[PDB]
Amino acid sequence: GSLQDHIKVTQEQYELYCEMGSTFQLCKICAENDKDVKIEPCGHLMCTSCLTSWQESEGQGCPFCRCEIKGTEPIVVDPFDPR
Ligand SMILES: [Zn+2]
Numbered sequence: 499g500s501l502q503d504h505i506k507v508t509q510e511q512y513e514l515y516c517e518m519g520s521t522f523q524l525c526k527i528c529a530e531n532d533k534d535v536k537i538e539p540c541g542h543l544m545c546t547s548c549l550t551s552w553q554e555s556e557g558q559g560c561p562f563c564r565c566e567i568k569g570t571e572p573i574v575v576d577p578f579d580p581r
């Protein structure tokens with residue numbers, strides 16, 4: 499009945515089934531890598547890709563804020579839907 503609008507699935511009408519929400523992934527410094535390393539006891543999150551580079555430039559604190567770097571641990575966050 500009335501749900502049949504006069505259109506056609508020429509290419510595709512129902513392709514719009516993607517949400518595209520919030521990407522919980524990614525490192526702010528590079529945007530390509532994700533939060534792989536957590537700087538302790540700072541609690542800052544980024545990828546070792548950026549962090550090593552910064553320490554190769556003397557790791558005078560996190561690359562952003564330059565706050566306390568003592569230790570580092572791996573992260574690996576949950577993707578869920580990074581689409
Ligand atoms: Zn990065």
Ligand SMILES: [Zn+2]
Pocket residue numbers: 537540541542559560563564565566
């Ligand atoms: Zn920090």
